[PDB]
Design an enzyme around this catalytic site. Structure first.
Site, PDB file in Angstrom:
ATOM      1  N   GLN A 197     -94.887  41.546  51.819  1.00 11.40           N
ATOM      2  CA  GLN A 197     -95.423  42.183  50.618  1.00 11.40           C
ATOM      3  C   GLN A 197     -96.654  43.011  50.934  1.00 11.40           C
ATOM      4  O   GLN A 197     -96.877  44.053  50.316  1.00 11.40           O
ATOM      5  CB  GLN A 197     -95.720  41.150  49.531  1.00 11.40           C
ATOM      6  CG  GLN A 197     -94.487  40.445  49.049  1.00 11.40           C
ATOM      7  CD  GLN A 197     -94.728  39.599  47.788  1.00 11.40           C
ATOM      8  OE1 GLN A 197     -95.883  39.284  47.439  1.00 11.40           O
ATOM      9  NE2 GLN A 197     -93.640  39.226  47.107  1.00 11.40           N
ATOM     10  N   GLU A 221    -110.991  51.887  71.646  1.00 14.70           N
ATOM     11  CA  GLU A 221    -112.383  52.005  72.034  1.00 14.70           C
ATOM     12  C   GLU A 221    -113.275  51.038  71.252  1.00 14.70           C
ATOM     13  O   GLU A 221    -114.264  50.524  71.794  1.00 14.70           O
ATOM     14  CB  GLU A 221    -112.810  53.457  71.846  1.00 14.70           C
ATOM     15  CG  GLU A 221    -114.008  53.887  72.606  1.00 14.70           C
ATOM     16  CD  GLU A 221    -114.060  55.389  72.744  1.00 14.70           C
ATOM     17  OE1 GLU A 221    -113.147  55.954  73.370  1.00 14.70           O
ATOM     18  OE2 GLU A 221    -114.943  56.013  72.113  1.00 14.70           O
TER      19      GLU A 221
HETATM   20  N1  LIG Z   1    -102.866  38.594  50.029  1.00 19.17           N
HETATM   21  C1  LIG Z   1    -101.658  38.074  49.835  1.00 19.17           C
HETATM   22  N2  LIG Z   1    -101.395  36.777  50.228  1.00 19.17           N
HETATM   23  C2  LIG Z   1    -100.167  36.239  50.034  1.00 19.17           C
HETATM   24  C3  LIG Z   1     -99.160  36.985  49.438  1.00 19.17           C
HETATM   25  N3  LIG Z   1     -98.055  36.212  49.369  1.00 19.17           N
HETATM   26  C4  LIG Z   1     -98.338  35.002  49.906  1.00 19.17           C
HETATM   27  N4  LIG Z   1     -99.644  35.002  50.320  1.00 19.17           N
HETATM   28  C5  LIG Z   1    -100.357  33.884  50.962  1.00 19.17           C
HETATM   29  O1  LIG Z   1     -99.500  33.221  51.871  1.00 19.17           O
HETATM   30  C6  LIG Z   1     -99.699  31.823  51.819  1.00 19.17           C
HETATM   31  C7  LIG Z   1     -98.368  31.104  52.011  1.00 19.17           C
HETATM   32  O2  LIG Z   1     -97.609  31.791  52.981  1.00 19.17           O
HETATM   33  P1  LIG Z   1     -96.323  32.658  52.551  1.00 19.17           P
HETATM   34  O3  LIG Z   1     -96.327  33.973  53.292  1.00 19.17           O
HETATM   35  O4  LIG Z   1     -96.313  32.887  51.059  1.00 19.17           O
HETATM   36  O5  LIG Z   1     -95.054  31.768  52.995  1.00 19.17           O
HETATM   37  P2  LIG Z   1     -93.870  32.412  53.878  1.00 19.17           P
HETATM   38  O6  LIG Z   1     -94.447  33.381  54.881  1.00 19.17           O
HETATM   39  O7  LIG Z   1     -92.845  33.091  52.999  1.00 19.17           O
HETATM   40  O8  LIG Z   1     -93.216  31.172  54.671  1.00 19.17           O
HETATM   41  P3  LIG Z   1     -92.351  30.064  53.886  1.00 19.17           P
HETATM   42  O9  LIG Z   1     -93.247  28.888  53.583  1.00 19.17           O
HETATM   43  O10 LIG Z   1     -91.205  29.606  54.756  1.00 19.17           O
HETATM   44  O11 LIG Z   1     -91.821  30.648  52.598  1.00 19.17           O
HETATM   45  C8  LIG Z   1    -100.331  31.516  50.472  1.00 19.17           C
HETATM   46  O12 LIG Z   1    -101.448  30.677  50.647  1.00 19.17           O
HETATM   47  C9  LIG Z   1    -100.768  32.857  49.918  1.00 19.17           C
HETATM   48  O13 LIG Z   1    -102.163  32.877  49.741  1.00 19.17           O
HETATM   49  C10 LIG Z   1     -99.416  38.291  49.040  1.00 19.17           C
HETATM   50  O14 LIG Z   1     -98.531  38.961  48.510  1.00 19.17           O
HETATM   51  N5  LIG Z   1    -100.669  38.832  49.241  1.00 19.17           N
END
Ligand SMILES: Nc1nc2c(ncn2[C@@H]2O[C@H](COP(=O)(O)OP(=O)(O)OP(=O)(O)O)[C@@H](O)[C@H]2O)c(=O)[nH]1
Ligand SMILES: Nc1nc2c(ncn2[C@@H]2O[C@H](COP(=O)(O)OP(=O)(O)O)[C@@H](O)[C@H]2O)c(=O)[nH]1
Ligand SMILES: COc1ccc(N(C)c2nc(Cl)nc3sccc23)cc1
Ligand SMILES: [Ca+2]
Ligand SMILES: [Mg+2]
Lengths: 440, 64, 418
Positions: free
Chosen positions: A15, A254
């Site tokens: 995302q 750099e």
């Molecule tokens: N800044 C930001 N952080 C995100 C977003 N989506 C998830 N996170 C962070 O990611 C953390 C959890 O990891 P995820 O990336 O959602 O989980 P995943 O990578 O899909 O791995 P799985 O657990 O297998 O689903 C959470 O604590 C969120 O704070 C986003 O769209 N923007």
């Protein structure tokens, strides 16, 4: 040449990758179909933006990117979203069962079933590069995929691409938007496993981004879209020297030479300014002196910590927009007198400056004011170790009771992977302490 | 000095290769160790479930 | 698609099962004939979690109906939405004895049930696992339900096993052997499920009589609570939101130790956002007849449904934890998590459903342990079970494992960070 391949892993990384590539397309005048009317070099070229986009013969500019998730839900929105035509389907890779918030499933159980396919897809991109500089990996610390699959991937990339550069944008967990109670476990496991395989890693604390949207953008309860649009501005500031040309343009590598005094000390603190609403930006232009000042106000940092109570090993200023070296040098001179900027005794105190003239873009419908000039500071301060301390503490509270450990053991992990990972983090916190002690 | 120049570049090649070898061996032992452990845990779950089938045969036998 | 397979066993299992399908079908805009007549498409985004797709855009619940006594499904097919269920997924026999459901009658019928389970499972893209509705106090849902768990778990050792388990109370049913049947079921649940919602008839009665003022509560009034809760606790599985949940993510984040997997559900109202929060943590809104202030919360999951300021929910959930910090274990940071979905349940503009893993659940098990030993020393009614081939050791062991679970819940109520 000098191409960069971006790899977006898990929900957070995918995302955030959407936000970034949308922003990149706006900055370069690339349409949602990949057409770029100002590129007169059809099918190729050695332009700056070509470090991030390849060109097809039919004039399409395709991100040098792979998206990977262990479940299809999030990447399906890329496949049906506004930018679907931008990506070749083979760049969007999805499994069927996600990691269920479990590092062990991302690294071992589910992850091992798709790692080979992912590396083949990355290989198809490397092979279209005339000289590949390295990889940018986007991922969360907290998710099962972002932590477990990322570290499996970083291990494999070290094997398949020797010491080719690997850089990270790593989303540090915050309680306001976290999804799992086990985020501290996955953060430590993946930080331990990746440390040797990553050259430079930019941590983005979701609580800092969350506070900035609330404090500076007047967003009552920020969503992922709110955070990611701001995160993509910071990522855009960092990658802008690679994607744009400029006499005053300084290459990210750099800066890297100054930011990384020892291999393990490779976690720069990013501070970004100005973050201001349209309503407040109106009839109020921020000077070079004002935005440079904002870089030393802790509430503008991508990671919560207090650099005033730590020591600097490096300080970099990346400007974009209507900025000239004369204004920058003036701003720095007054700042050095009026601010708490203490360097470790073993490193020079200058500030490395880079200016890119292309001014910042905003996504239509965002909350960020469009401004004439903006800046991202990258500093190496011992204060960033506070972020490790908070996380290591949260890990300790649960691990002493072995809480939730049975979910990782059930997937094949052993308690000694937990203790080994925690010790490495302990040594890392000790490393940050040692580099800040004066010489003898 | 020429002799020293090609020893420097040989050393660089030898470190980079050794780093690649160790990483490749490390995760090969990690994945092999992870498959054994997970299979031992699933096998143990079945061994105890399959014992509940034995105990249910006996319970029906004690009825006769 | 991440399919859940739903199984309902015995009398109680099928009654609350049907009501669950009535409430969620109504919530997803599925009519009794399987046709979608809905307003939002949030209703169909994740509809495949619980429903199978059919020709004519018919949605068929992925449900298996089981009972050793015929007639119970007769009421189901004639009940509301009775024709939405796939007819081959009805499995029936031709007696309130756990041993007969687990060892004698239920064994005769269990393979034919597993055949239907296989058919629904094999047609899944990626099976999350199973969800069982049953009582612990009868014979079919208790004894055959727990056998079905053991056999399903043997064949799907890597899928999540989740149950809604109805606990017996002398305030609803007088059958004297319930404490035996309940203790024997718990002995199976501790070993062979990943998550169990303790749906306590004693809490359901006490709620109907005291809060709703129903002087003579029926199984109808009790089960209206049960469907409201079941709708709440599944909200994040069925709808798209900021946190897309499944049975494994529920287990991982709610179950700190494999055996401590028995949840207190709560519902509110039985309103203002601070009131919902306050009522939801109120002992009078729990479906498990345990005071949370008599124990500690290991983990908590909260769902707010309806249109409301999520900023206000964020502040109130933080407020309740700060004012009640002593009732949340300090060695699990950030152990309370809240989700928000816009569709409310039928008739409510806004609701709050609560899922607690609290060490106060030991009170529930202590009640049954007392009712169990009151009989076991007397060896009363044992012949109904020894007659089916059971040996006393089994009764002792089931009692002894349930007593161990309470100690363990007490062990962590007492642990401290420093
Ligand atoms: N800044 C930001 N952080 C995100 C977003 N989506 C998830 N996170 C962070 O990611 C953390 C959890 O990891 P995820 O990336 O959602 O989980 P995943 O990578 O899909 O791995 P799985 O657990 O297998 O689903 C959470 O604590 C969120 O704070 C986003 O769209 N923007
Ligand atoms: N809360 C609730 N409990 C029930 C219901 N039906 C049965 N029970 C409980 O289940 C126990 C008897 O189980 P039963 O349903 O007869 O099992 P079966 O006949 O083998 O299907 C009694 O202790 C009741 O308290 C119900 O609709 N609601
Ligand atoms: C311990 O912290 C937690 C508890 C639960 C979850 N997840 C996966 C949920 N799953 C379901 Cl089904 N419903 C809900 S409501 C709020 C969370 C939630 C996540 C973290
Ligand atoms: Ca070109
Ligand atoms: Mg995911």
């Amino acid at each position: 040449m000098r191409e960069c391949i971006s790899i977006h892993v898990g929900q957070a990384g995918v995302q955030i990758g959407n936000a970034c590539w949308e922003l990149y397309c706006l900055e370069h005048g690339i349409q949602p179909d990949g057409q770029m009317p100002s590129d007169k070099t059809i099918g190729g070229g050695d332009d700056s933006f070509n470090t991030f986009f390849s060109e097809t013969g039919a004039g399409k500019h395709v991100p040098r990117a792979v998206f990977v998730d262990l479940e299809p839900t999030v990447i399906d929105e890329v496949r049906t979203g506004t930018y679907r035509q931008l990506f070749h389907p083979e760049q969007l890779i999805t499994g069927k069962e996600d990691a269920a918030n479990n590092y062990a499933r991302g690294h071992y159980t589910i992850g091992k079933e798709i790692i080979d396919l992912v590396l083949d897809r990355i290989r198809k991109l490397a092979d279209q590069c005339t000289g590949l500089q390295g990889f940018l990996v986007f991922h969360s610390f907290g998710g099962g995929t972002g932590s477990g699959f990322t570290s499996l991937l970083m291990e494999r990339l070290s094997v398949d691409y020797g010491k080719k550069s690997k850089l990270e944008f790593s989303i540090y967990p915050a309680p306001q938007v976290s999804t799992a109670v086990v985020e501290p476990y996955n953060s430590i496991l993946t930080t331990h496993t990746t440390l040797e395989h990553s050259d430079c890693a930019f941590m983005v604390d979701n609580e800092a981004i969350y506070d900035i949207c609330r404090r500076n953008l007047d967003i009552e309860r920020p969503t992922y879209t709110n955070l990611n649009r701001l995160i993509s501005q910071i990522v855009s500031s960092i990658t802008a020297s690679l994607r744009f040309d400029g006499a005053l343009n300084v290459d990210l590598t750099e800066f890297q030479t100054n930011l990384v005094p020892y291999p393990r000390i490779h976690f720069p603190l990013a501070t970004y300014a100005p973050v201001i609403s349209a309503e407040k930006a109106y009839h109020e232009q921020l000077s070079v002196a004002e935005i440079t000042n904002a870089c030393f106000e802790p509430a503008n940092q991508m990671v919560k910590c207090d650099p005033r109570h730590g020591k600097y090993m490096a300080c970099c200023l990346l400007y974009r927009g209507d900025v000239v070296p004369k204004d920058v040098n003036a701003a720095i001179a007054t700042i050095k007198t009026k601010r708490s900027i203490q360097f470790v005794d073993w490193c020079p105190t200058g500030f490395k400056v880079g200016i890119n003239y292309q001014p910042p873009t905003v996504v239509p419908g965002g909350d960020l004011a469009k401004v004439q000039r903006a800046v991202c500071m990258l500093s190496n301060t011992t204060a960033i170790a506070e972020a490790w301390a908070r996380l290591d503490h949260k890990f300790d509270l649960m691990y002493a009771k072995r809480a939730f450990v049975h979910w990782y053991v059930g997937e094949g992990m052993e308690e000694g992977e937990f203790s080994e990972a925690r010790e490495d983090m302990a040594a890392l916190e000790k490393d940050y302490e040692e580099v800040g002690v004066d010489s003898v | 000095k020429r002799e020293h120049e090609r020893e420097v570049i040989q050393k660089a090649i030898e470190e980079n290769n050794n780093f690649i070898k160790m990483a490749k061996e490390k995760l090969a032992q990690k994945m092999e160790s992870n498959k054994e452990n997970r299979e031992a845990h699933l096998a143990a779950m079945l061994e105890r479930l399959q014992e509940k089938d034995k105990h249910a045969e006996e319970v029906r036998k004690n009825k006769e | 698609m991440r399919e859940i397979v739903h199984i309902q066993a015995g009398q109680c299992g099928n009654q609350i099962g049907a009501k669950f399908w009535e409430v969620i079908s109504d919530e997803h805009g599925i009519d009794p004939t399987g046709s979608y007549h809905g307003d939002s498409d949030l209703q169909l985004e994740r509809i495949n979690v619980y429903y199978n797709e059919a020709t004519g855009n018919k949605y068929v619940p992925r449900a298996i109906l089981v009972d050793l006594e015929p007639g119970t499904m007769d009421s189901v097919r004639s009940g509301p939405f009775g024709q939405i269920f796939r007819p081959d997924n009805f499995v029936f026999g031709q007696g309130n004895n756990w041993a007969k459901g687990h060892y004698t009658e239920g064994a005769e019928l269990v393979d034919s049930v597993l055949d239907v389970v296989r058919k629904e499972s094999e047609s899944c893209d990626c099976l999350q696992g199973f969800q069982l509705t049953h009582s612990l106090g009868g014979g079919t849902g208790s004894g055959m339900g727990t056998l079905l768990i053991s056999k399903i778990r043997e064949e799907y050792p890597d899928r999540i096993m989740n149950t809604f388990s109805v606990m017996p109370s002398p305030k609803v049913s007088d059958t004297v052997v319930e404490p035996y049947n309940a203790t024997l079921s718990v002995h199976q649940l501790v070993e062979n499920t990943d998550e169990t919602y303790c749906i306590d008839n004693e809490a359901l009665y006490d709620i109907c009589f005291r809060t709703l003022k129903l002087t003579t509560p029926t199984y109808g009034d009790l089960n209206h609570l049960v469907s409201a809760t079941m709708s709440g606790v599944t909200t994040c599985l069925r709808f798209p939101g900021q946190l897309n949940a499944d049975l494994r993510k529920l287990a991982v984040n709610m179950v700190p130790f494999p055996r401590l997997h028995f949840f207190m559900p709560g519902f509110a109202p039985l309103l203002t956002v601070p009131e919902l929060t306050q009522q939801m943590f109120d002992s009078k809104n729990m479906m498990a007849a345990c005071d949370p202030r008599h124990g500690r919360y290991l983990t908590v999951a909260a769902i707010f449904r309806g249109r409301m300021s999520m900023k206000e929910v964020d502040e109130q959930m933080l407020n309740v934890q700060n004012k009640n910090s002593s009732y949340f274990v300090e060695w699990i940071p950030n152990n309370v998590k809240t989700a928000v979905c816009d569709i409310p349940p039928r008739g409510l503009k806004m609701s709050a459903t609560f899922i607690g893993n609290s060490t106060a659940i030991q009170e529930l098990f202590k009640r049954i342990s007392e009712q169990f030993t009151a009989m076991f020393r007397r060896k009363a009614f044992l012949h109904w079970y020894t007659g089916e081939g059971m040996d006393e050791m089994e009764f002792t062991e089931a009692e002894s494992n349930m007593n161990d679970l309470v100690s363990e819940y007490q062990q962590y109520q007492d642990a401290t960070a420093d």
